[PDB]
Design a protein around this ligand. Structure first.
Ligand SMILES: [Zn+2]
Ligand SMILES: [Zn+2]
Ligand SMILES: [Zn+2]
Ligand SMILES: [Zn+2]
Lengths: 156, 32, 142, 151
């Protein structure tokens, strides 16, 4: 039930053009990670949010989105000329003995890709009504918080 | 001020005693 | 063999058979067996026949609330195990249950999670208090 | 026993024929980028095949380990159901969503709730009620002040 505005659609289709019709992919450290986005997003919304209950849902949604990004980037959030990049990342991670982690690697734009695939992905299996509404509500206010400063993370 | 706010629930549970009465107390607090 | 301690007064007034007027009558609830004095809950009868006596600690199965007409809520009747489905919410906070719920056991991090969640929220509230009173005194000058 | 096209990336190339499902994958179209000429020796169970023989194609044990998995991670609880489908998901190329391409025993279900959720809900709703009555009192006070100033 997502109705995202035209600017997210435009930046997503221009990323599609850069990833399909062009060989160019995102930078290695992908600059600002979703770490940053979710972190500050919490630091602004929780100071705008009023109830302790709503802040519990905010932190819960942040942690779940981070873990889902980590556990689903290798499953859907990849394109051509990025599987080799992911292979290079996982061979580099085993060199310094630290375990691999997608959250602090990929850019906030693959997070927006996860939000884009989320409506079709959620309705595939058995899921609630009210939990679904909570998820799209957190989706929509996270998206409008992105819409406040798209130019911070989506400028070429 | 903060400490009593976070400590109210389990001190209420300690004052309740029986776990069935605390279950009905949580049912009351949910119905509210 | 222990003493039925009344819930409200936290005492059992057994009496002494030399001063039997010092003995307070005690009954037990017909559902949770919680013993109550006849004076702590205002009652004169012992509820010997008719309906089962319910102590004040039990949650109601029927309540009326004011609309400000009215609205009524009745708890769902018990259903046998072959046709009764108990389901666990995925949403923890704000799940609109019909008032018909079941309590599951709670299984150190959660304890401190509650502590910071009140801190932050109350902080935000102070800020919400401080953002509106300044607009009030800045309205009086105009 | 094999597929002419890769069911993940949707072009033809070097394939790995699975045993049960006829779908085949490229050497990178897998959760892990299986190194060509270095593929582990065995039957080559895929993620779907490993999900079926992990649960032994019976519903009761799969729901019980799904509930056990959700019980483990209550911090990511709303996404916990969505973490499970991933295990039973064969990684594929990101095909765009369609809108992105453009420009009765269930009625009397008893809710299984916990003490901490009741605590959070009670605190949330009392804070909501207290500050909506406080803010409406403040708004009525401001409106009455404006009415007395204008009069
Ligand atoms: Zn008494
Ligand atoms: Zn009773
Ligand atoms: Zn492929
Ligand atoms: Zn297979």
């Amino acid at each position: 039930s997502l109705q995202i505005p035209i600017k997210l659609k435009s930046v997503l289709v221009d990323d599609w053009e850069y990833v399909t019709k062009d060989k160019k992919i995102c930078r290695l450290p992908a600059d600002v990670t979703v770490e940053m986005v979710l972190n500050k997003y919490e630091h602004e919304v929780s100071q705008e949010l009023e109830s302790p209950g709503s802040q519990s849902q905010l932190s819960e949604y942040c942690a779940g989105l981070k873990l889902y990004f980590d556990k689903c980037l290798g499953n859907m959030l990849l394109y051509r000329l990025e599987r080799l990049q992911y292979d290079e990342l996982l061979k580099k991670s085993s060199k310094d003995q630290k375990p691999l982690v997608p959250i602090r690697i990929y850019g906030a734009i693959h997070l927006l890709r996860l939000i884009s695939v989320l409506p079709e992905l959620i309705s595939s299996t058995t899921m609630d009504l009210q939990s679904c509404q909570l998820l799209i509500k957190q989706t929509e206010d996270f998206l409008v918080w992105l819409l406040m400063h798209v130019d911070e993370y989506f400028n070429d | 001020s903060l400490n009593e706010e976070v400590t109210f629930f389990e001190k209420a549970k300690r004052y309740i005693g029986n776990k069935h009465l605390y279950t009905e107390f949580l049912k009351i607090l949910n119905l509210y | 063999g222990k003493f039925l301690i009344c819930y409200k007064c936290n005492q059992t007034r057994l009496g002494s058979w030399s001063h039997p007027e010092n003995s307070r009558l005690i009954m037990t609830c017909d559902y949770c067996q919680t013993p109550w004095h006849l004076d702590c809950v205002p009652r004169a009868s012992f509820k010997n026949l008719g309906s089962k006596w319910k102590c004040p600690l039990h949650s109601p199965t029927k309540v009326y609330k004011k609309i400000h007409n009215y609205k009524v809520w009745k708890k769902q009747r018990l259903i046998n195990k072959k046709n009764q489905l108990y389901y666990e919410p995925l949403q923890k906070i704000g799940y609109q249950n019909n008032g018909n719920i079941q309590i599951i056991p709670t299984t150190n991090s959660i304890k401190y999670d509650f502590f910071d969640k009140i801190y932050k929220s109350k902080m935000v509230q102070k800020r919400k208090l401080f953002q509106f009173q300044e607009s009030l005194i800045d309205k009086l000058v105009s | 026993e094999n597929e002419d096209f890769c069911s993940a990336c949707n072009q033809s190339g070097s394939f790995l024929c699975c045993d049960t499902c006829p779908k085949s994958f490229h050497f990178l179209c897998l959760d892990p980028p299986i190194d060509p000429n270095n593929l582990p020796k065995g039957d080559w169970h895929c993620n779907e095949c490993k999900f079926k023989i992990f649960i032994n194609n019976s519903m009761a044990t799969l729901k019980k380990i799904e509930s056990n998995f959700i019980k483990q991670n209550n911090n990511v609880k709303i996404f916990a159901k969505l973490l499970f489908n991933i295990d039973s998901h064969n990684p594929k190329q990101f095909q765009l969503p369609n809108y992105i391409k453009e420009t009765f025993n269930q009625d009397f279900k008893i809710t299984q709730i916990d003490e901490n959720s009741i605590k959070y809900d009670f605190f949330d709703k009392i804070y909501k009620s207290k500050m909506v009555q406080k803010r409406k009192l403040f708004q009525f006070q401001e409106s009455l002040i404006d009415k007395l100033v204008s009069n």
